[PDB]
Amino acid sequence: TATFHRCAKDPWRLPGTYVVVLKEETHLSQSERTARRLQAQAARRGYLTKILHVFHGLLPGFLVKMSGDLLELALKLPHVDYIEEDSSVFAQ
């Protein structure tokens, strides 16, 4: 059910950093645990990861610096709604 999205404007993509968005009523405690589960699962497969931020207040989830190789794995985490590759914004 969980889906992956990245910017359609290829020059504006920022591969290697991902916003993991959890389902609407996911609690901060759950978000934090899901982030740690990802890091543990990643490490077992030989990947370094860094949780840059845990989101609460508007959207539940977290920002993770990791190889895109781990996306299939990350999409299977509990509570995941979708994952979006980070991208650029610009002064108008």
Partner: protein
Amino acid sequence: SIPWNLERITPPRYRGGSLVEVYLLDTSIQSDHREIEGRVMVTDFENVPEEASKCDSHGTHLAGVVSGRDAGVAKGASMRSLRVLNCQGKGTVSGTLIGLEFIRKSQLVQPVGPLVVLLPLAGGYSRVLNAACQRLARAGVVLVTAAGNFRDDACLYSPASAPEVITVGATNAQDQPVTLGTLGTNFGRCVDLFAPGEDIIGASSDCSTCFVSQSGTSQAAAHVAGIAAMMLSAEPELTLAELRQRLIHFSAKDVINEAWFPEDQRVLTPNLVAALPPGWQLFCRTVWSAHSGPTRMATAVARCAPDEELLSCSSFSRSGKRRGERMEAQGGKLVCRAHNAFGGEGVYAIARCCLLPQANCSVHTAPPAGTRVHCHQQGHVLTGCSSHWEVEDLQPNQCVGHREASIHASCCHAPGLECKVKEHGIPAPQEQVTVACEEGWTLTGCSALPHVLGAYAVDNTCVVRSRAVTAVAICCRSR
């Protein structure tokens, strides 16, 4: 001497953002500039990707446009600045998200009055940025964003495309869309209105009393952030729907030459330039859906805000390959659903959404039989007629459709409302037929008498597009 842009937003009869706070997510700012000193608080929130006078240029100017002493829209208004753009004016979606979250957390910790959040930035369409903006809007915060400077459809950019954000295009001193090199203002159905966005004087970070002229949809959005601040200062209880309806209502209408836009975007782009405001009145707006796409059973849906009533529903296809539209209840609330024809490229649903408190509105439907239905109850007024069909080839308070089509009447109990119907038929097989409500009346419904491409309200004008032909306007006003 009044800057052209501040004059342009002054209405034809005229006479401060103080209980309102405006958040700015932008570059660093020169907060001790005399335009804004003491008025803009720097949060020192910073989330920017890797790469003073130049770093601070963009944000300092926009702070000045919103709140500057001499050259601001909402002179003196309170602002808080977050830095999400680096010295080159570049940021990230994730940084913007974190900034939006910071604002919500600040509000929860120390509640104040109405909040306006100005987002003078754009990237590509972003599911997550759009969702975060929608959540912040649903939490009760007003978001204003740049349409974007790409001479493109704003629906392909974020947060421009976001549901529930006020998206602002840029017009110049001739009320024409702004050219920016080989590009220019964005356009299309995700743009809510335009505002002055060329040659806009404001605070220059070059020196504490210096001024510079800048152009862009950023500057335009800053105007609307300022107007919103003043509207919310005067009427602090406005919902987002009420605020948006006023922005539309008080805008100058039909001053933009639509030839500037690509052909297919002309019907979708609101011909509105923002202005400050100058007894209860009926406000309505036209809401275009996203295109249905070409699937044979494709539908498009146009929805109103929770505090709006849907008073009518029409549809449009460029080819004319359509099966019409119906009003149906979705989550205890009426929506406008349009149907594609097999072999059609798709359709738009077009809702007329109105602020009508204490309205008991309902749909009366008849199946194929011409087919007829009427608002039969005493005290009820017809506000709109819709018609859909399955096949592939075709009085007071009454709708009439083709014999092979279903017919749908929107009927409201609203005793304080008076409605009349105005028809205009042209024999010539002419591409367009229009009929406008009289001044002081609000168009609630637009349709064609039963090969039309479709029909849509433009302000208080009903437009019928043909590949006689009669345009039919339902016009209502408070008694």
